[PDB]
Symmetry: C3
Subunit: 45 residues, 3 copies
């Protein structure tokens, strides 16, 4: 029974790491879009 709980915790932790990885990728892409908007507006203005 202790292992069943421990396995659950492992699964959650693993899922949390994947989520953290996803959020980092999202932040990078979001920063790219910020840069692209900045670049577009710069070339015009």
């Amino acid at each position: 029974r202790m292992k069943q709980i421990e396995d659950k915790i492992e699964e959650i932790e693993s899922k949390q790491k994947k989520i953290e990885n996803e959020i980092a990728r999202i932040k990078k892409l979001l920063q790219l879009t910020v840069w692209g908007i900045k670049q577009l507006q710069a070339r015009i203005l």
Copy 2:
């Protein structure tokens, strides 16, 4: 004590689903903005 562990695990799993859902929605909108920036670069510049 075991009750608290079981309850907290359920809360964590629910919050994780909430987070995954928020991430899904963020990703779709981010893909839209990437597309819009691409269109503006071409159509303006």
Copy 3:
């Protein structure tokens, strides 16, 4: 084994709060990018 479980649960909860705070920040900046793309389109095209 119960203490170990409880410590990991606390760690997971702390991380979930951090993640929720990251998502809040991402959402705000993403809303600004949506507005900026809208603005460039409106002003020029």
